[PDB]
Design a protein around this nucleic acid. Structure first.
Lengths: 97, 103, 78, 59, 95, 97, 83, 93
DNA sequence: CTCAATTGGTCGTAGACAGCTCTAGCACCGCTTAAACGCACGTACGCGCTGTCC
DNA sequence: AGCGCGTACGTGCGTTTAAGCGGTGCTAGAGCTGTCTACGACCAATTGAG
C-alpha cells in the first residue's frame, strides 16, 4: 500500500533522535573543511580528530538551529520549515545581524 | 597524601598546582584547592551517577556519550549548567512537537 | 564540495532536529549557514594555528575556537 | 434510534438492521443538526461563502 | 614519551563509588575529563575575578565558595557548598 | 472633534521614544520592586541609588530587546504584533528560561 | 518593612512605553502580565548575583559595581556605571 | 580618590578626531567602561593564548592574534595595522 | 618505572581586622501634577475557514 | 489566504493616584587607615602514584 505522506517522516525522526552517530558523510565534510581553510591559509593540515570535532560542532549547531526553526514554523502554525524561519531563528539568536 | 587528609578522590595537589600555574591569582590559599577539589568531585559524582542510572535504563555495561548527554539534558540543573555545551556522540533528546504528531 | 552536504544528509540532520516537513529551499539555506559557521570556526582555529606557527590544525585549535564562539565542545580534551 | 424508527419499523428484524448499519458508519462523524446542515450546504449547487448562508440554503 | 596527564583514574574511582557495576567508555571518559577541566576553568576564573573585584591577592576557599554559588544552579550550588564545607573541615581536621 | 485613527498615535509614540533615551519605567516603583525581590534573597540590604538606576537601565534595555524579538516573531502570514506565545518563543530561541 | 506586590509598580502604560521603544505597535493585554513575569525572573537572576557579590564583599550595601559584575557574568555587560 | 580613568587620553583622542566636539561626562564614563572592557577581553584572550602555547611572557604577537580573534575582520585589519605601526615606531625609538 | 606530590620549616607580608568617620543612603513630610487608572467606544486586525495550490 | 466575523485594545477624556521634587532630618556602615601576624610562597629533603 501507500503510507500517507508524512507518516515515515515521524518514524525517521524517531530513528535519528535515537541514533547519535554523525549524519554528514565524513570525506565530503572533510573536503569542504579543507576548501574553506585553504581560503585562509595554504598548505594546511588537519588532524583527523580535529576534522571530526569540527563535524561534531557543526552537526550539533545545525540540529539546534533546525529545532529552533521548527519552533518558528509551529509558531507560523506551519509543519514545513522555510528559509524565512531560519532567518527569524538566527535573527533572534543574533547570529545574522 | 592530602586528598586522604580530606577524604577526596580528586587530587588536591594537582588542583593546587593548576590554580597556581593558571595565574588565577597571586596566591591560592591552602583551603581553596581542597574546597575546589571537593566541588569537582561532587560534580562529576552527580553526573556519573545519573549516567550510570541511564545506562541501567538503557541496559548497558558501559557509560557511552549517549548516556552522558541523556543525563545532562534530562537533569534541568545540569542542562542549565551545560546549556552552552555540546558533547561528542551525544545526540539529542526525544523531541517531537504536538502539531507534528497525528491526532 | 559544498553540495557534498547531500540532500539526504540534510534531511537526516533536520530529522534529528525533529523537522517533519522540509521546503527544498532549506537545503541551500542550510549549506549557506553551515558554510558561514565553518568559516568563522576555522578562521579562529587557524588563527590559533598561525599563532602556534603550526601547519597542522589540531583538535585543540578547534576546541578553543568553539570555546570562543560560545559552543563549548567536550570530547577532544578541554 | 429516532432515525431507523423511520426506516425499520420493527427493530425485531435483524436483517434490515445489519443492512442499514453501514450507512450509519458513513455518518457517525455527524450528530448535531447544525453540522449536518453545514454538510448539506457545502454540497449546494450555489454554496454560500459564510457557513450561515450554507445552512440557510440547505434549510 | 608524551605522558599526558588526565583525571581519568579519579573519574573511574568516583564511578565505582556511585556505580561499582558497569564501566565507562574511553569516549565518555574523555567527555568527563573535558567536563572536569571546564568546570575547574569556570570556577577558577570566577574566583579570580572575585579577587580582583575585592583587590584581594588570595583566592581563598571563600572565593571558591561564592564562585560556586554564583555559577551553579541554586540546588546544585547548595549541595556543592555543603560538600566543600565538609571537605575543608575534614582537611583542617588533619595535618 | 478630532481623533487620530488607531495606531497613528502609536507610531508617533514609537518615533518619539526611539528619538529619546530616558528611562521609561517610573523610577520609584522600580526601586521598591528591586528592594522587595532582594529582601527575598537577603534582608537589610542598602541599595546605592546608582545601583538601582543601573538595574533599571539593564531591565529596560533587556525588555526592549525582548519586545524587538517578539515583534519580529509577528511576521508570518502578515500576522501583526505580539502575544505571550511570541514572548515564550523568542525567549526559548534565545535559550532563556 | 516587608515589601510586597511591588511587581505592580510596573504599570501597564510603562510596559506600553517599553513596547513602543521596542517597536511594538499593538500589544496584547496578556503581554503585560507575562512581561511582569519575565522582568521578575530577570531581576531575580541579576539581583541574586549582585547579592552574592555583596555577600562575598561582606558589604551590606548593594553597589552599582556589584550589579555591573552580575550583568557581565550574565553576559549582558552594562556600560555607564564603572567596571 | 585617585580613581584612574581614561578621561584625559580619550580627550586627547577626541581632540585628534573632533577637537570642536566635547564629550559629556556620562559619554566619557561609557567610553571608560568600553575601554576597560576591551582591555580585559583582549588581555584575557592573550592569557588563554599564552596558556595554550605554554608561554608565560605575553608578547605583542599574543596581543596581535588576540585582536585578530576578537575584532571583526576589517576592524581587526585596521587594529593590526595600527598596532604594528606603533610597535615599529617604538622599536625604532 | 619515575618526577609530581609531599613534608617541616622560614620568610614577610596580605589581609585580618579594629577602630574611625562622615558618605550617602535611610526615613519623611508635602505639595505639585504627570502619569495611572478606569471607563467609553469602536474598528481593525486575531480569530475563523475552505478555496485552491503543490 | 481572501474575506468574513467581532470584540480587543487604541484614542480619548475625566478623575485619582502617587512619582517626582525637594526640602530636611538621621545615621550606619563604606571605606579609609593604622596595627599584627596568619598565612602562602620558597625552599630542601622526602615519597610513591599514575
Amino acid at each position: 500500500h501507500r503510507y500517507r505522506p508524512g507518516t515515515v517522516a515521524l518514524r525517521e525522526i524517531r530513528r535519528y533522535q535515537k541514533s547519535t552517530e554523525l549524519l554528514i558523510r565524513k570525506l565530503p565534510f572533510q573536503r569542504l573543511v579543507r576548501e574553506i581553510a585553504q581560503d585562509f591559509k595554504t598548505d594546511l593540515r588537519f588532524q583527523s580528530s580535529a576534522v571530526m570535532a569540527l563535524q561534531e560542532a557543526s552537526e550539533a549547531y545545525l540540529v539546534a538551529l533546525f529545532e529552533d526553526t521548527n519552533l518558528c514554523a509551529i509558531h507560523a502554525k506551519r509543519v514545513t520549515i522555510m528559509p524565512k524561519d531560519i532567518q527569524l531563528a538566527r535573527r533572534i539568536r543574533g547570529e545574522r545581524a | 597524601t592530602r586528598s586522604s587528609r580530606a577524604g577526596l578522590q580528586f587530587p588536591v595537589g594537582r588542583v593546587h598546582r593548576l590554580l597556581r600555574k593558571g595565574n588565577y591569582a597571586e596566591r591560592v590559599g591552602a583551603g581553596a584547592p581542597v574546597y575546589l577539589a571537593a566541588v569537582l568531585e561532587y560534580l562529576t559524582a552527580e553526573i556519573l551517577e545519573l549516567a550510570g542510572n541511564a545506562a541501567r535504563d538503557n541496559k548497558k555495561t558501559r557509560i557511552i556519550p549517549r548516556h552522558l548527554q541523556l543525563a545532562v539534558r534530562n537533569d534541568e540543573e545540569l542542562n542549565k549548567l551545560l546549556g552552552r555545551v555540546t558533547i561528542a556522540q551525544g545526540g539529542v533528546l526525544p523531541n517531537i512537537q504536538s502539531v507534528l504528531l497525528p491526532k | 564540495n559544498i553540495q557534498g552536504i547531500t540532500k539526504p544528509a540534510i534531511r537526516r540532520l533536520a530529522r534529528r532536529g525533529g523537522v517533519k516537513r522540509i521546503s527544498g529551499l532549506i537545503y541551500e539555506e542550510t549549506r549557506g549557514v553551515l558554510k558561514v559557521f565553518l568559516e568563522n570556526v576555522i578562521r579562529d582555529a587557524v588563527t590559533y594555528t598561525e599563532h602556534a606557527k603550526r601547519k597542522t590544525v589540531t583538535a585543540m585549535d578547534v576546541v578553543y575556537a568553539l570555546k570562543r564562539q560560545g559552543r563549548t565542545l567536550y570530547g577532544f580534551g578541554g | 434510534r429516532d432515525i431507523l424508527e423511520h426506516i425499520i419499523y420493527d427493530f425485531e428484524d435483524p436483517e434490515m438492521m445489519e443492512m442499514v448499519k453501514p450507512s450509519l458508519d458513513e455518518a457517525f462523524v455527524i450528530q448535531e443538526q447544525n453540522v449536518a446542515l453545514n454538510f448539506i450546504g457545502s454540497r449546494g449547487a450555489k454554496p454560500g461563502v459564510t457557513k450561515e448562508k450554507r445552512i440557510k440554503y440547505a434549510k | 614519551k608524551t605522558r599526558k596527564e588526565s583525571y581519568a583514574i579519579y573519574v573511574y574511582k568516583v564511578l565505582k563509588q556511585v556505580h561499582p557495576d558497569t564501566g565507562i567508555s574511553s569516549k565518555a571518559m574523555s567527555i568527563m575529563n573535558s567536563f572536569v577541566n571546564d568546570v575547574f576553568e569556570r570556577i577558577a576564573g570566577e574566583a579570580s575575578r572575585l579577587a580582583h573585584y575585592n583587590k584581594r591577592s588570595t583566592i581563598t576557599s571563600r572565593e571558591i565558595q561564592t564562585a560556586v554559588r554564583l555559577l551553579l544552579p541554586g540546588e546544585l550550588a547548595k549541595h556543592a557548598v555543603s560538600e566543600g564545607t565538609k571537605a575543608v573541615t575534614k582537611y583542617t581536621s588533619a595535618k
